Amino acid sequence: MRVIFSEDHKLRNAKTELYGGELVPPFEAPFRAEWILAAVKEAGFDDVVAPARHGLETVLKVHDAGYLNFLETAWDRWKAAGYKGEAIATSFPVRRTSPRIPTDIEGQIGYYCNAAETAISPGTWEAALSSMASAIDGADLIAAGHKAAFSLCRPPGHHAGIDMFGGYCFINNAAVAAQRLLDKGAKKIAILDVDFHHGNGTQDIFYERGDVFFASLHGDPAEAFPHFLGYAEETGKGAGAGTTANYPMGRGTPYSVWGEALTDSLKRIAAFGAEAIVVSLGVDTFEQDPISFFKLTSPDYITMGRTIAASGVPLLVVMEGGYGVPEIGLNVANVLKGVA
């Protein structure tokens, strides 16, 4: 399978992340793409191509225009305001608050944010565009007839909701990919999130749409970021009633239980009738991940990939989470091995 990768991902190189009450070096650093890229090539996937140029037409069908306009100029405005650090929101539109949109940069960054551990830095916008481009190109390959494809996205995107950034995400790459397949002719597409954290951004985007089925396996929100979405009771709303399936699991969950949730999600995706599956791939489900509590081993990823590929429909794999140890590359490559 071809691999879509952009070097502009390095344009996103934030110097701080709010974690544990301190501003430490970002968990989502440029070396993640470097390590993963090296491992896939090592696993035989050496056909890496850069993404072509794309407009905002696709993304404008899954993200709010106000939100996108905000991201494009967020940094400039923050710096213009005289702030010394990176752009970080501290005030949020939570319970029982007005739906009105602030005008100043301080108010808008909070309005458009769901997580304060994510800082907007110089070049974040450009990086997010390149990453989105990689997802769009991967979709085109699938739309062209290829059975599999890997969009090495960075920054990740499953936490980017309709009009909010957070969890290191700015533009929901998988959502853009699924939307791309639809504009290319598909009628039904499914997004499967295997990343450890719930794909709240993705769920929000398609929660009221019946044309995209969203399935996510993840750490119980009761005790895992993003914390405020991902419960099994969330199955869809209105036009999207019934097209959302969350599978929250506790601490220490091994492939034994995980594998079962995967099977079920695939059963519901088939029943949905997906013409293709966009896989939000996160390897932070690894037993050695620094910020997750699942216990999957490197071999499990080969099993995971094979199972998903057995669906019989084309697959577009999109990079999401996975941090710390260098095995993230191994684990990502193992998934592509299974799929191939």
Next chain:
Amino acid sequence: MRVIFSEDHKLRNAKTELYGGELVPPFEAPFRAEWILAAVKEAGFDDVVAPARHGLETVLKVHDAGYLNFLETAWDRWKAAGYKGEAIATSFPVRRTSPRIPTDIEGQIGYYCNAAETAISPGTWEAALSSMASAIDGADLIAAGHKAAFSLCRPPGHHAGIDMFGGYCFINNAAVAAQRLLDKGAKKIAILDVDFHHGNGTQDIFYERGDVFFASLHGDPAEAFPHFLGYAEETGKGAGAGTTANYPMGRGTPYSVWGEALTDSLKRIAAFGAEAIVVSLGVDTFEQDPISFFKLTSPDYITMGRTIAASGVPLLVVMEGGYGVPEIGLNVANVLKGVAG
């Protein structure tokens, strides 16, 4: 008027505050109380008494029990979880999110917070309780028959809602004081928030309550913290309809315009029929204060006190915000002179 002040306020001495993308020393520091106290004493108000001991009965009538339980054990759980810094929420229940309450410290701190620039640290719980106590004793003096009283509260409270802390606030002292007056006999009470920022927390607590009228003058939320509340359109909900009046104002607002809003809020308060008025006093409206965009001068705080005191009803002044500028005490003292007459 008598001044209620607790030394335990210093127990609230957070080391960090998220501002402009950095962690810096909190703007709501202990020296604020120190300079305010000294200024009011120099102005004659030197009858300072420490607050008495109080339970949680009053506060439990305005704050969610879960939220209060969270505050009490917040720091211990955060430390136990192994975080090196102070407790600061990073994830928040914003638009289109589940109403379920997380079970771990990481999720709950976010669930109970409305502003990440506030950090919970050793002593916050204790400090917040002593500050609440000062508010309670202040209200008790009013219920006794005193014309006015000053509760030198710290930490402040008007940004703490029913079940959320933020804006340097944990327990809404003004709200507690108002509840206390109702418990001592009053049927109707009003809270007037003159602090530069909107008192989103106080509004939240009494938004569906008809026994307490909430008026507030503040910088337009469209361009000022807390950013998501304080619009003129918010007049109340359900049982609390019509008992909430917001007076947002733009950049460079002179006392000339500010006083007009003060006069209208007092007119609405009088029409409501308040038996007493709790004044959430913030002096960050001062032209020399760095965080605000209003242009009030020191003399205007004397006018402010006079006007509110002219209402004819007893007044409990509760200390809120105000950047730590050298004139912070002078301005608070001027408001008290105005009330004194």
